[PDB]
Design a protein around this ligand. Structure first.
Ligand code: NAD
Ligand code: NAD
Ligand code: NAD
Ligand code: NAD
Ligand code: K
Lengths: 336, 335, 336, 335
């Protein structure tokens, strides 16, 4: 059982995923490739000795009858248009996070998806396939630590380039916690509040670090410290305090050395290494289900819409200096 | 070798009585005092300690043998006892908190200043815990750069029915209020108490509580207080600086591999956590005093600062708003 | 560039590797299969929905013109015959560990390999591909802890079936340490000694635990505790003390729980989980090199001979109660 | 209050002199003794202690004032001082080792039995370490079932030139020899010293060493000894039972994240590792005695066992074979 995939957007992760889908994920052949920049797509096909047809306009890729599944790794600005066109053409869609920046752009995709009467979209929030997050999820769902009450998270990264501004702390970075905490706790957010701790004097190009207080609808208190120029490495923390215990996300194992009065392990520096395995796992799940004839079971268009709205309210909080309210429609039955 | 009189032989009083007589060098207990008749003598008898008993503390203070006054009485007597000792020109070791109100702290401060000699230490013992001294030294060395964020936890297994919402601040968070300020060498400008969803296992107070405190330079401190966390007594203190993070250690435990689990022990009894630091704070206090030096632990000023801060905290519990911490200029006397 | 594989021996691990090779490893296609038990091979084909020629005699699998690579997952007793026949037919060989039980059988494969006059054999000692082992190796080789002097290892397993006898603690279990420590240290063994500590009163089917002292040629002292009915799970330790520090092998990351006065993480119980990833990584390296037109770079026929002779001395030490000497010829230049 | 005289005011002598006058309750130091002239008094001078200074320990022993003799003299002197003290009917706290030769241990045992009363404690202080006590409790509860294999490490950063190959046993491993025996409630039957490849940074002794010991019931004990490991002072002790493993903790340290490393401190100064066990072993001793109870620490018989086993280790270094530990029957005096 094997499925035909077209990829739109052969940028940084476009290539990566191109390599993945032809070489690592089973039940999928890449038959079509597409980038708006002239040499791009073919250049990657060349890199990997992959044979696909190459299209400059994504529309012809989606119209290509070979193409059964559309994979969206293009720039955010493009996401909604490509997704809508795929859904209107009755094709499945894996779309990288975020679904789209605006709530409204997420709504058009939801609308396109429902007209098919069939769940057909998964979003690339890969942390849900990370094995440690899966372990944490199961501890929560087992009831072992009882009802969750408080959550403490850290999302730390060694440094940023100058073009990463204050809003990207939310849009690019926090967005992961936005999605993963929601999934861990099976709750939405009612409020968000971005605090600005003392500015790092190493950092001149954005406000950093930041401290976000989020309340879920039942009142679970989430604190996430975000420090994207913490200097020492890439470091994810997630602790959940329930009524009768606490559960802690593990980190990446390292050999340990005793040397010169110090007992030490490594902390990762390259952010891409942290959830690198989950990319393959999330696609493998997606392709296993579609090939089994079942709907996707990962993050949905609705999950993408949720994240967008929550991220939006955090950014608003940055600007106004106030707690902001998260406003969301009823979860459509379609997504239940 | 200084001669001490302990005022108030209750739960902590008797332990301090045993401690000063047996574990601390450069001091001997010459008098004791409690308003519940028998109490003071019972403890004397229990530990086979010979001291002059006093029912009224004024006599204990006037006693020409008593050179140092240790205050282990109920919060209400603190300020009254402290003031008299200072007016008698005697040194004071007072258990935390300094006093019930900010104004009582002001009363001690003025009595201390009238002696024109720094003479009071407060029993905020965490500053003497070896793990906190290590964390402080790491912060001060510049290893992690300038601190910008702090995350703390003060967890306890369960509380009795009598423990009320304001006690989360007054009895429990008070320790963090003092230790964070000492760690960072700053004061607070704002406090905010958030109440996460209420634990179904607790009906006698609001629990847990999440406190967000800002220092004068904008350092952000988050502390989770969960006094019915069920699992034990657990203290966390992580400091994120500009280029590193420093983590307070916990109590070492032997580790076990069995039935598919690797585990260590978490403390249950809150009294065991900083037990060592009582002996250490006292040894320091008397080593300085015997050496002709002023006390160098928490000052009357530190206790006033903790009072004002706790108040804003309790006021935040009530109002649902961020509350401002309002302080007068620090008097040079405390510098 | 893709190579075609016949797999001889579709048993517990053969079915597993049949699956990985077909579905997980790129640059390989499985075109043929063989097992001695009627219908066993085809059952796994069916199980996994893979099309391959099914042969009853491995000779016919080897002689099959589509087979370029022979994967040997048969019973130990068959390894040498299969490997020799595959080399005799100028096909590459991947062979599960051990290469063979007897030195003389390892020699037969060595001879057949050298008759080809090129390096064609990898043995499935998968620990060398495990990420923690690779990391430990890099610390050693960088000189950070200085010259290695002493090593402490543990190979623990929760329990064994009655069929598992005293010699198997060496043949099945220690064989992994036999090979990996030699790789870590770049040395052979000059002597081995098996102590029998106090017998576990929970164990009546073999002598357990066992404690093994091995000396490398330069005098590096290696101690390995083997407890295959330790009850608590599957647990691998490896510590290297050098002249100026110590390096410790990591274990499997686990979420941690604070509950009822205990702070804890999980210990694995299923042995197959521990090095599960290293299977994929080992074949992926094997097939990449082969497709690059390069010789395999994993454990060689000589490494399989080394492990055999050393295991034999350990078993001899079990029987005699004495330290036994490891007797080896000179490493052929062919294996350097 | 019991009255103590101390024989031998060297490194440890003067430290114990400080301990017994300062932080141990129920003991007064009334006499000291060192053979190097001025030595003893200089130490009394340092810590402002009033005490009678004797050149001859016989004199110290004959004081109407001295009830307890604390022996902190060179090993060579131990048996004579102890025999004499027990002869004059005085309690003995003796630092480890009891004596180096078994014959000298036997003389102390004979002296003690002639009193028909248990009177000697030995300063194997690890038994009072809080981590070893927890380890012991875990073993004894049955959590890990019957112990079968032990792995221990005794690492030290570096040694001075005067520290020789036999000292790896007599000074260093002696501690494991005693504490494994107490943990397991068992004696040894065989010992074997392996010599791994010699550290190139060590020219003055054979280092590291790897000791395989077998208890009477066949529990196998491996101890790695590395007294020039370079990195610090590091004690490891893992006990594998029938159904689990228990691990000695180490000294808790604050943790730092910085420059791509997560790290904690390893002690460098060997004296800091069990520093608390000294106060505790003495507090136990004097408590027991003050309550009219026999000492409950390591006995003369434990010192005898340590000596015989160490001897066999040193004999194994020399001969390169496994050596047998030959033990007589434990007298009932010591049960
Ligand atoms: N951890 C993760 O899930 C992960 C990591 C990084 C990026 N992403 C997401 O993946 C997406 C791609 O990011 P990137 O970092 O690879 O960016 P990129 O700029 O490197 O790649 C974007 C590519 O899309 C192409 N493109 C834009 N519009 C197109 C259109 N109309 N038709 C065809 N191609 C078009 C661009 O030419 C470019 O090659 C982003 O949406 C990003 O948020 C996800
Ligand atoms: N970790 C710590 O630093 C710590 C721990 C426990 C208690 N404390 C503090 O120690 C103080 C005593 O607490 P406790 O738990 O022992 O309380 P307690 O109630 O057991 O003891 C107080 C005693 O003082 C006596 N007393 C009250 N007023 C007096 C007066 N006018 N004159 C003489 N005696 C008087 C009471 O009769 C009582 O016996 C409190 O301030 C408390 O906050 C600090
Ligand atoms: N971690 C590891 O690398 C690892 C793990 C398990 C097994 N192994 C090894 O892999 C090999 C197979 O082990 P297993 O547990 O799958 O054994 P198994 O008994 O489950 O399978 C062996 C199979 O080979 C077949 N066989 C025997 N002779 C044959 C022949 N002449 N032609 C075709 N098939 C023949 C048998 O019919 C049997 O099905 C062994 O060498 C074992 O040591 C390695
Ligand atoms: N961790 C421990 O339990 C520990 C640590 C250090 C030393 N020790 C033991 O403590 C003892 C003393 O050790 P140290 O390092 O202080 O050595 P040291 O050499 O500094 O002290 C020995 C002292 O005793 C004196 N002395 C020798 N013979 C004497 C005699 N006949 N009469 C009176 N005094 C005599 C010496 O002059 C010297 O002052 C040793 O037995 C040693 O093994 C134990
Ligand atoms: K906005």
């Amino acid at each position: 059982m094997t499925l035909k995939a077209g990829i739109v957007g052969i940028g940084m992760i476009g290539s990566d995923h191109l390599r993945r889908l032809a070489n690592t994920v089973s039940g999928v052949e890449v038959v079509a490739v597409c980038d708006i920049v002239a040499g791009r797509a073919q250049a990657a096909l060349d890199k990997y000795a992959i044979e696909a047809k190459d299209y400059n306009d994504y529309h012809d890729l989606i119209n290509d009858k070979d193409v059964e599944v559309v994979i969206i790794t293009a720039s955010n600005e493009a996401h909604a248009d490509v997704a809508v066109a795929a859904l209107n053409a009755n094709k499945y869609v894996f779309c990288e996070k975020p679904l789209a920046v605006t709530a409204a752009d997420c709504q058009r995709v939801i609308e396109a998806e429902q007209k098919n009467g069939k769940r057909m979209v998964q979003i690339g929030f890969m942390r849900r396939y990370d094995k440690g997050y899966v372990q944490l999820k199961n501890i929560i769902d087992s009831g072992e630590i009882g009802q969750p009450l408080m959550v403490h998270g850290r999302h730390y990264n060694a440094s940023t380039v100058p073009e990463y501004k204050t809003p990207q702390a939310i849009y690019e970075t926090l967005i992961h916690e936005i999605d993963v905490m929601h999934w861990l706790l099976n709750e939405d957010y009612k409020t968000v509040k971005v605090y600005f701790p003392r500015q790092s004097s190493l950092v001149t190009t954005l406000r950093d670090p930041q401290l976000v207080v989020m309340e879920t609808t039942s009142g679970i208190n989430i604190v996430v410290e975000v420090f994207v120029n913490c200097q020492y490495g890439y470091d994810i923390h997630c602790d959940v305090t329930g009524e009768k215990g606490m559960a802690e996300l593990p980190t990446v194992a390292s050999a340990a050395v005793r040397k010169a009065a110090k007992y030490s392990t490594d902390i990762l520096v390259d952010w891409k290494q942290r959830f690198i395995d989950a990319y393959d796992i999330e696609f493998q799940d997606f392709f296993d289900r579609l090939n089994a004839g079942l709907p996707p079971a990962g993050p949905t268009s609705w999950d993408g819409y949720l994240a967008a709205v929550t991220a939006d309210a955090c950014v608003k909080s940055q600007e106004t200096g106030n707690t902001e309210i998260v406003e969301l429609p009823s979860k459509p039955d379609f997504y239940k």
